[PDB]
Amino acid sequence: SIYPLSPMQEGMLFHSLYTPDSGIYCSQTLITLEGEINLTVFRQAWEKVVERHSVLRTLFLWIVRKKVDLPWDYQDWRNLLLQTERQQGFEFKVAPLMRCLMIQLSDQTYKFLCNHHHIILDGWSMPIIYQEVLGFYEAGIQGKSHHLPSPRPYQDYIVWLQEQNPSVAESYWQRTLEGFMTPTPLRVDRLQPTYKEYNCHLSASLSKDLQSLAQKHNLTLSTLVQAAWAILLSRYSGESEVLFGVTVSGRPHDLSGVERRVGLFINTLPLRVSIRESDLLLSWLQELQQKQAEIQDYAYVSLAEIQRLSDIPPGVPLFESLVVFENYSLRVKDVENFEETNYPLTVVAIPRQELLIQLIYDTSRFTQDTIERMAGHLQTILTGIVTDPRQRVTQLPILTTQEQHQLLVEWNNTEADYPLDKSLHQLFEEQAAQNPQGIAVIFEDQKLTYQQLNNRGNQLAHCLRDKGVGPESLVGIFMERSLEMVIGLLGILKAGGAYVPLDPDYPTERLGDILSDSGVSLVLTQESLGDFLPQTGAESLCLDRDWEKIATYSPENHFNLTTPENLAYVIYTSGKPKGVLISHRGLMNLICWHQDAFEITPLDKITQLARIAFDAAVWELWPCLTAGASLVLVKPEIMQSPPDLRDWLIAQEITVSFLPTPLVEKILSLEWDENIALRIILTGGDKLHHYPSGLMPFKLINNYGPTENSVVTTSGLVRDYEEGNPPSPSIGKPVYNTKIYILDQNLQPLPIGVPGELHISSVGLARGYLNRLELTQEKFISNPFNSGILYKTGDLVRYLPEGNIEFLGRIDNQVKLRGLRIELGEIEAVLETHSEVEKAVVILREDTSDNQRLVAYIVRKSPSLGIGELRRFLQQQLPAYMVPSAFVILSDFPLNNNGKIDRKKLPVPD
Amino acid sequence: SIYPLSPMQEGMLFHSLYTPDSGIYCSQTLITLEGEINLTVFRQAWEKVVERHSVLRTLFLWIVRKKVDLPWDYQDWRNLLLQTERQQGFEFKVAPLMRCLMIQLSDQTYKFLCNHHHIILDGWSMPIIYQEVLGFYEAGIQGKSHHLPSPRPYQDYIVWLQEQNPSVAESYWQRTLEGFMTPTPLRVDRLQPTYKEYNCHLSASLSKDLQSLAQKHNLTLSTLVQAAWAILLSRYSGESEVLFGVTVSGRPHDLSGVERRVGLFINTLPLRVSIRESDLLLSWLQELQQKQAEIQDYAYVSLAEIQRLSDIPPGVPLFESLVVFENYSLRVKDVENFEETNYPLTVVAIPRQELLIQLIYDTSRFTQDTIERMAGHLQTILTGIVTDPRQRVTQLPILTTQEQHQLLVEWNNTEADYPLDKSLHQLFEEQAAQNPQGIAVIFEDQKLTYQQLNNRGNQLAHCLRDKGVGPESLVGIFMERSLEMVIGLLGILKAGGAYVPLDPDYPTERLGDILSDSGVSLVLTQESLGDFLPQTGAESLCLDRDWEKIATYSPENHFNLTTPENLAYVIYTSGKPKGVLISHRGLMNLICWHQDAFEITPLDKITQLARIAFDAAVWELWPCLTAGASLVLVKPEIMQSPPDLRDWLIAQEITVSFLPTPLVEKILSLEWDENIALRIILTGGDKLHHYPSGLMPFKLINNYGPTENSVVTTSGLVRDYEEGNPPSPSIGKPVYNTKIYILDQNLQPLPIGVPGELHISSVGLARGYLNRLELTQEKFISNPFNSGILYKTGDLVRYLPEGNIEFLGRIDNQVKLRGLRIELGEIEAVLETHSEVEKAVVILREDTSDNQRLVAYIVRKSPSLGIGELRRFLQQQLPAYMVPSAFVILSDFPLNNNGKIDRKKLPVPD
Ligand SMILES: Nc1ncnc2c1ncn2[C@@H]1O[C@H](COP(=O)(O)O)[C@@H](O)[C@H]1O
Ligand SMILES: Nc1ncnc2c1ncn2[C@@H]1O[C@H](COP(=O)(O)O)[C@@H](O)[C@H]1O
Ligand SMILES: CC(C)C[C@H](N)C(=O)O
Ligand SMILES: CC(C)C[C@H](N)C(=O)O
């Protein structure tokens, strides 16, 4: 009994000897017994166990451990809970004396409690000790012998350790963990210690089908469970490589297949699992079997040794999930109050006649609803595995029947009747029929009635159709926001053509490219701008100078000639920008949806401030003009001042107004008359950061959608912040005749809480890109879920629990194996909380392709705050690894031409 | 004049447009003119320059730049300094308008001021502009023409940039900077923005000899200067690879050899220089020539692009030193108030007829004395290079004649007469002659006079010499601190033998190894411990039981038989420990020095608390007994309580007391009677962290030395903290007959402020190690500076400015290319400043050989403080990269058996 400590034993000792009273290494176990007991023999049982297991009578000399053959257990007392309260709270004490480092107590209402230090025992070792203590009692409450083999002394683990070469195991852990730079994030967990148990019981049938499959193919039930969890983790995380804990014996020699012995050995090990698109479930399970066997050959270096030895940063865990397969005077419960640490999520497979799978979760990290669904997913995956193991791993189903249905069917039940026969201009002219005298457009003093607008529109149409314009014609429009411009738009539409906005402030070369791209032969403009057009060969008509030409022509409505498939407009998104071909159907849907959702009626006064090259302008003009309301063009002057715009909105008695996101953010800080005409403010285009105060008189509607889907895809009222609310307002839910899908990189559905790529199926979808047939086919695919078409948005989003969508960002800004476990927007929200921070954006890399170095751009309210005081504020709220290297104070955000924040113009730090 | 910005131009623009008014990019230049000036023509001169250089009339459109041929410079006014005060302070303003971004002003007392933005100009570009503006004035204050070629438009740099492939330059900067993980630290700089200039003028002879050498060997004067600085940096830094800035043209096409042109180009580039032990100066200079040429081929990516692209962490500079070779109505001065940034140290070679080398230094980072010496070093290196360029680079001299002398000769002038004929026991017995009745030893109640001790010593000697003991005999001593033990020690010495302390608390196996190592055939012990000796074959004598045997023998002094070369003691240092063979000469020197320095006289009462296996015990016993004083053995009880020991020291009227370092640290926090007998407290053994309060009644002496050099090498009084003081008390200066040397890894001398390895030349040096002849030869070498022997200590130290030595740590704990620019002890001192921190130790790696992760172990005063609040405190005081990843709260430091802090028993974090 002269032996050296294991490294793991030393570490532990030193930690205890020189850090203040800790109890990190104190494991308690508490046993509810009922019946009656021969106390005398129950004690002698414990003494029997203490007499046989050498560690249960070891002591430490301080670099050396001694087993003696002498000490045992002390009871303290026996004979309105009062146990937790004090009687269990008060243990900061163990001496490395011969006296077994294990103190016990039996009680009045019959409760046993065992305290011990991990320097002698393992999580594995306690079960063995109950079993052996119960068996020495039952064969001895009956004067018989409980015959058991003599155990190994655990002083021969120690010699075994020394026979092994640490450099072998260290090279192996280094080689195999190399690429792996941060822990697999579960991304179903909560922003910010009690644990709970969700029991997921598998049917007798599934249990048996699993066992069967294991036998047929030389796999174990533990491998099927780990596999199941590996598959689940890859879907939740988005990573095709995952890493979780598995529990192991850690005691070797192939006594893994015969014997059982007590002490401190390695009990958990990291298992790194990769899943490729070609992987089939049988082969991949064969492979998993090996890696789990293989890692056990290098089980003679601690996990702390393995953490540092990896590429994972110091300070952070290399996994947040653990899988344990418990291969194993009546007892009532064994409550384990080693609560001192536990992993956020541990999945415990207990292989009784039916397979139990317990999910033990940190309740600060996961909702009950999230965990229950996790249960459903494993259940789905396991049933899928036995049902057809020839299947590709990346295609195996995860959602339950009810989930599938809810997400893909019920939440997509947005079908709505709308006039699919009609066209934009028709609707308009019914509007101009029924209320000819109504103010249709207003610009400062100027004013058009529905008749003025219809008549002057019909004239330009007639002019235009003499010039060659019909269905599918693309006519340029190069004009300042004005009445002329509405007439222009309406003119092209009536001719049967489709308008191509040309922005008045564009350089002459970009205007060039648009005209050559779009192939327009005709551009409507105005004398002011005429000379800025490049000379491309195209005719230009001035609606100001040349109005005389146009006046000559009929102000009659013409025959309606366009079909819903005909192009209505072509608008560029941001190598070059790409023009999107929008048909009339799209717009009909939008208009009919919009008018319904926001109850637009001819009473309404509707603002028009988006520049005509952005598709928001479509959604300002046509719902309004086709409904009878009055469109108020806004001087861009007014828009330059949030408070002035506020006053101006109030002044002009505007009822419903679209404000782009950066602007609406600002007006929401202002204070507002309580009784104004403004009922709705619509916003969208960039990610809205801020919830409205309840003080706001209007209701605030968030909206989202690509240009490739007729302006709006998703819409939702935004209330004041509640509590269960995400860090930034939802983008709402799909609009009429729109279905959405949140999909993984192999086009597979994902459950609530998991981020994926938004795909859209809609009557709103573009015909495709102008002159980009390849890309049209890459992005507009055949829908896996219907006979209809699916557009890939490239936007990263997740379903919230009531069916709202959280917008996260762009799929291209995601990098594999550096997903941070905290969503960037979570930091943003936190930084924004501290007053003096008005707006924060957090980017991954503003530097180039070498490093990433996450930076945070802050716009301050006053100069009081600086990048140090901020830094400590964020390491107070989050930990580190969740705090950026650089913080850049800005004065204002680089906005692109439409209002969206311009990333590539953000200043790179230092 | 349609052109895209350079990347470097864009970055700059964005930074200006969206960060709050900054003036980071504002360069000012201020020109003292005297004489009289045709104001009218001076202006027109500037207009001439503005008319020719395209950037001097460029504007920015916001991704595009425009040159116009129209704007120029405005004067604002003209006609008790008041300029700095306001008139120069107030510039936060430049608009990217056609109006040249360059505002000027001429003044009353004749001062010109030019403000411009780096988005148009370079540090290189301003000189060209003065020259061209002065030349258009002088040929025009005389109605003549100043004829100059027409410049390149700098719109063809931009096309050149675009013709180049960034991936080529990026691969090159990545490949060549790879190993290089932190900036070359100068380690002559100060712990913690004004600049100063030290002019270092080289003689006409040296200037010319350099130029000559350049011609002979196809090198330039710039390469000789960079070389010089590279050599200096490697010595200061301790790194055989260095990295500094060099300035470059950045404008290419081989117009580097003809033309001169204005704009913004790359001006600084990182030059990585390696120096190997075999390198010869000619070949190595040839090579340096190439690398400096080569790097200029990749001069089309910014330095910010090169920083991130390197292995240097984000946030930190990749060099703190820059070398610029300025190859280039009278003007008085050009004062450059672009002070907005400058590097901590820039070395400017100005190649006028004699070579000037300016050292421009941040005065918060370097003392005037440090810089002057730097000047002397370059001067030394350059003179060395011309004198013999066949020389090895690592052997070239750096110290001046006076420095060499001061460090190696004058500060080592410690020769002292001492009785080299005599031996320890002789001196003793003269002491026991002259004052037979004096109390020699005291232990609680027990007491020996000089006669008791001498007589009982002579008896044991006679006993011993019948048992075979003589010169060179090693006798074991295995005894509790007691009177018997002093008698034992004194007995062995008189017999002519040398004692080998065996520690009473050692395990029987370590005792075994010592006895087999030392080969003792005889061990003096005591009945108490006899049975703990292992049975090795050696005789044991009990000075307690067997005293009767010993009493029979003569109490006469014997003939003195030992010579000063004879062994006196053998003591192990901490694979296995190694026994050190100390002779009598060593001890004579120590005793005679000690008695002189601390004025020991027979009045003195001297404490004895070091365990006998530590060599401190030698330095407690023999100075005292050989002087006539009374040695008080201390109960180790008393030593367990700082306050009790204090009281006990005061109580017993002890005059001079050795307390090991961890203990003295603690007593210095106590409060102290002002009038006590205690005059000196001696300490040493570990690094003392704390300076005494002035309130302390005694004086506190720090001391240092390896066992291999008779206990003490260096000694120095420690006062209260002053200001210029290092973070922890000096270890003083060499003792009698001791010379020290602070040397680099090629055994070369180093100047003040530079850390190196301490080597000792002394009469105190061990004969060598017991039974380790190899190691004796590796560590005890032939002295490069005398005919005498040199011991390599493995300790890292530096000379302070008055000749004190700062102890830094162990050479083995240093790792190349991760030296931090801040000394660990600097952090320690800072952490210690904050009350609630009683003691802090900062280690490099407590984890294993994969990462390093610098950790800090803190002992707190009360539990109030925690590892977060500490963390922010240290990122407040230092920046980051100077703050550890882990902080471990301890309760107490793992001490080894002698008092030194035990590193390998520090708890590894997490
Ligand atoms: N409400 C919104 N919240 C967040 N991002 C949005 C929102 N609306 C639009 N987007 C983003 O803006 C894009 C539309 O850009 P484009 O169609 O090119 O003008 C979408 O694909 C999203 O990435
Ligand atoms: N005063 C001191 N300050 C700092 N380190 C010290 C001091 N005295 C001794 N040392 C260290 O202790 C060593 C002596 O250890 P040893 O001779 O083996 O007992 C030296 O080589 C130093 O590294
Ligand atoms: C949802 C709307 C605000 C328009 C959206 N920004 C788009 O780019 O189509
Ligand atoms: C300088 C003295 C305190 C002794 C020193 N610690 C040594 O190890 O020799």
Tab-separated table of N, CA, C and O in Angstrom, chain B residues 140-187:
chain	number	residue	atom	x	y	z
B	140	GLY	N	11.244	82.992	-59.355
B	140	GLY	CA	9.961	83.678	-59.401
B	140	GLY	C	9.893	84.802	-58.367
B	140	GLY	O	8.925	85.554	-58.319
B	141	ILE	N	10.959	84.909	-57.579
B	141	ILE	CA	11.085	86.105	-56.717
B	141	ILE	C	12.102	86.783	-57.633
B	141	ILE	O	12.530	87.913	-57.330
B	142	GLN	N	12.442	86.109	-58.744
B	142	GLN	CA	13.462	86.616	-59.699
B	142	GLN	C	12.936	86.464	-61.127
B	142	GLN	O	13.758	86.285	-62.040
B	143	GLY	N	11.617	86.510	-61.307
B	143	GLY	CA	11.009	86.429	-62.650
B	143	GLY	C	11.698	85.450	-63.584
B	143	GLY	O	11.864	85.798	-64.767
B	144	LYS	N	12.059	84.258	-63.102
B	144	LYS	CA	12.648	83.224	-63.992
B	144	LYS	C	11.764	81.976	-63.958
B	144	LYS	O	10.729	82.015	-63.276
B	145	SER	N	12.148	80.915	-64.673
B	145	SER	CA	11.372	79.682	-64.601
B	145	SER	C	12.114	78.572	-63.849
B	145	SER	O	13.282	78.291	-64.126
B	146	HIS	N	11.395	77.960	-62.889
B	146	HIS	CA	11.793	76.748	-62.187
B	146	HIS	C	11.267	75.547	-62.969
B	146	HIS	O	10.112	75.168	-62.805
B	147	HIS	N	12.120	74.986	-63.840
B	147	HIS	CA	11.739	73.925	-64.762
B	147	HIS	C	11.831	72.584	-64.045
B	147	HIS	O	12.871	72.290	-63.453
B	148	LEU	N	10.729	71.807	-64.075
B	148	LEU	CA	10.650	70.492	-63.436
B	148	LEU	C	9.921	69.526	-64.354
B	148	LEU	O	9.079	69.928	-65.128
B	149	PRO	N	10.221	68.213	-64.335
B	149	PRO	CA	9.478	67.284	-65.187
B	149	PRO	C	8.014	67.328	-64.758
B	149	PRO	O	7.689	67.846	-63.687
B	150	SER	N	7.118	66.812	-65.599
B	150	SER	CA	5.723	66.677	-65.203
B	150	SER	C	5.577	65.356	-64.447
B	150	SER	O	6.155	64.359	-64.870
B	151	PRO	N	4.842	65.316	-63.304
B	151	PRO	CA	4.831	64.153	-62.409
B	151	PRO	C	3.921	63.067	-62.953
B	151	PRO	O	3.189	63.331	-63.898
B	152	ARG	N	3.976	61.854	-62.386
B	152	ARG	CA	2.960	60.867	-62.721
B	152	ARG	C	1.678	61.225	-61.979
B	152	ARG	O	1.720	61.816	-60.897
B	153	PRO	N	0.508	60.936	-62.585
B	153	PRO	CA	-0.763	61.430	-62.058
B	153	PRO	C	-1.343	60.741	-60.819
B	153	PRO	O	-2.394	61.168	-60.341
B	154	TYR	N	-0.713	59.648	-60.380
B	154	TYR	CA	-1.200	58.863	-59.206
B	154	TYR	C	-2.544	58.223	-59.457
B	154	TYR	O	-3.211	57.754	-58.523
B	155	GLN	N	-2.986	58.354	-60.697
B	155	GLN	CA	-4.229	57.672	-61.095
B	155	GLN	C	-3.726	56.413	-61.787
B	155	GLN	O	-4.552	55.573	-62.190
B	156	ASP	N	-2.397	56.305	-61.892
B	156	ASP	CA	-1.793	55.162	-62.564
B	156	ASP	C	-1.093	54.243	-61.567
B	156	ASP	O	-0.661	53.142	-61.917
B	157	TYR	N	-0.936	54.722	-60.329
B	157	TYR	CA	-0.756	53.842	-59.188
B	157	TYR	C	-1.998	52.967	-59.095
B	157	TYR	O	-1.904	51.743	-59.036
B	158	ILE	N	-3.160	53.626	-59.165
B	158	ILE	CA	-4.427	52.964	-58.935
B	158	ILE	C	-4.640	51.843	-59.960
B	158	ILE	O	-5.074	50.752	-59.575
B	159	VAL	N	-4.307	52.080	-61.242
B	159	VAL	CA	-4.451	51.039	-62.254
B	159	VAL	C	-3.403	49.953	-62.020
B	159	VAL	O	-3.640	48.775	-62.298
B	160	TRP	N	-2.231	50.373	-61.533
B	160	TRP	CA	-1.180	49.435	-61.188
B	160	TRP	C	-1.639	48.481	-60.071
B	160	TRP	O	-1.507	47.263	-60.215
B	161	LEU	N	-2.194	49.037	-58.975
B	161	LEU	CA	-2.801	48.273	-57.888
B	161	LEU	C	-3.730	47.191	-58.427
B	161	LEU	O	-3.680	46.045	-57.990
B	162	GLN	N	-4.599	47.576	-59.367
B	162	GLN	CA	-5.620	46.674	-59.867
B	162	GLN	C	-5.003	45.587	-60.744
B	162	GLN	O	-5.562	44.502	-60.838
B	163	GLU	N	-3.844	45.860	-61.359
B	163	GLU	CA	-3.164	44.862	-62.176
B	163	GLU	C	-2.497	43.810	-61.287
B	163	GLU	O	-2.062	42.761	-61.760
B	164	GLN	N	-2.390	44.097	-59.991
B	164	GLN	CA	-1.686	43.199	-59.102
B	164	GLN	C	-2.703	42.266	-58.460
B	164	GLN	O	-3.856	42.646	-58.270
B	165	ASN	N	-2.223	41.089	-58.054
B	165	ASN	CA	-3.050	40.011	-57.535
B	165	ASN	C	-2.868	39.898	-56.014
B	165	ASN	O	-1.924	39.252	-55.529
B	166	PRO	N	-3.777	40.503	-55.205
B	166	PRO	CA	-3.703	40.444	-53.742
B	166	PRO	C	-3.380	39.086	-53.125
B	166	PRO	O	-2.746	39.027	-52.086
B	167	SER	N	-3.816	37.993	-53.747
B	167	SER	CA	-3.544	36.671	-53.203
B	167	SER	C	-2.046	36.347	-53.268
B	167	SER	O	-1.580	35.527	-52.472
B	168	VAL	N	-1.295	36.977	-54.195
B	168	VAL	CA	0.143	36.727	-54.298
B	168	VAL	C	0.846	37.318	-53.073
B	168	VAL	O	1.621	36.627	-52.419
B	169	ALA	N	0.566	38.598	-52.788
B	169	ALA	CA	1.171	39.330	-51.686
B	169	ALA	C	0.700	38.792	-50.342
B	169	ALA	O	1.433	38.857	-49.362
B	170	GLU	N	-0.548	38.325	-50.289
B	170	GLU	CA	-1.115	37.817	-49.054
B	170	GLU	C	-0.466	36.480	-48.716
B	170	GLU	O	-0.286	36.163	-47.548
B	171	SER	N	-0.154	35.664	-49.731
B	171	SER	CA	0.439	34.366	-49.446
B	171	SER	C	1.844	34.605	-48.901
B	171	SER	O	2.268	33.935	-47.958
B	172	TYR	N	2.514	35.612	-49.486
B	172	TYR	CA	3.898	35.941	-49.179
B	172	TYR	C	4.040	36.473	-47.757
B	172	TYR	O	4.920	36.004	-47.037
B	173	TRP	N	3.202	37.460	-47.378
B	173	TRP	CA	3.165	37.946	-46.001
B	173	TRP	C	2.754	36.834	-45.033
B	173	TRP	O	3.209	36.822	-43.894
B	174	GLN	N	1.923	35.882	-45.466
B	174	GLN	CA	1.500	34.831	-44.555
B	174	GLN	C	2.689	33.893	-44.366
B	174	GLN	O	3.068	33.624	-43.226
B	175	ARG	N	3.305	33.453	-45.475
B	175	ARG	CA	4.399	32.486	-45.414
B	175	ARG	C	5.516	33.027	-44.521
B	175	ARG	O	5.954	32.307	-43.621
B	176	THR	N	5.940	34.293	-44.761
B	176	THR	CA	7.156	34.841	-44.172
B	176	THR	C	6.953	35.326	-42.737
B	176	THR	O	7.947	35.484	-42.037
B	177	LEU	N	5.718	35.531	-42.268
B	177	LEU	CA	5.529	36.024	-40.908
B	177	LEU	C	5.040	34.940	-39.940
B	177	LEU	O	4.659	35.252	-38.801
B	178	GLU	N	5.125	33.673	-40.371
B	178	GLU	CA	4.310	32.617	-39.793
B	178	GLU	C	4.683	32.376	-38.333
B	178	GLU	O	3.853	32.517	-37.436
B	179	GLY	N	5.928	32.015	-38.075
B	179	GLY	CA	6.284	31.601	-36.726
B	179	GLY	C	6.080	32.689	-35.669
B	179	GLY	O	6.180	32.446	-34.474
B	180	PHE	N	5.811	33.905	-36.127
B	180	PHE	CA	6.098	35.095	-35.353
B	180	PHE	C	4.831	35.534	-34.641
B	180	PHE	O	3.967	36.124	-35.279
B	181	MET	N	4.747	35.287	-33.332
B	181	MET	CA	3.451	35.230	-32.670
B	181	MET	C	3.219	36.433	-31.750
B	181	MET	O	2.075	36.717	-31.383
B	182	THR	N	4.292	37.143	-31.369
B	182	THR	CA	4.179	38.384	-30.600
B	182	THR	C	5.323	39.332	-30.986
B	182	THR	O	6.406	38.903	-31.417
B	183	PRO	N	5.141	40.657	-30.783
B	183	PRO	CA	6.165	41.632	-31.128
B	183	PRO	C	7.445	41.550	-30.288
B	183	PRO	O	7.430	41.312	-29.084
B	184	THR	N	8.564	41.784	-30.971
B	184	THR	CA	9.855	41.854	-30.347
B	184	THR	C	9.800	42.850	-29.203
B	184	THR	O	9.485	43.997	-29.419
B	185	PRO	N	10.037	42.449	-27.942
B	185	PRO	CA	9.948	43.357	-26.821
B	185	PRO	C	11.334	43.892	-26.621
B	185	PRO	O	12.294	43.140	-26.799
B	186	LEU	N	11.369	45.142	-26.180
B	186	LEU	CA	12.603	45.887	-26.079
B	186	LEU	C	13.222	45.729	-24.703
B	186	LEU	O	14.390	46.061	-24.554
B	187	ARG	N	12.407	45.352	-23.710
B	187	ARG	CA	12.816	45.017	-22.351
B	187	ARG	C	13.910	45.923	-21.793
B	187	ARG	O	14.721	45.485	-20.991
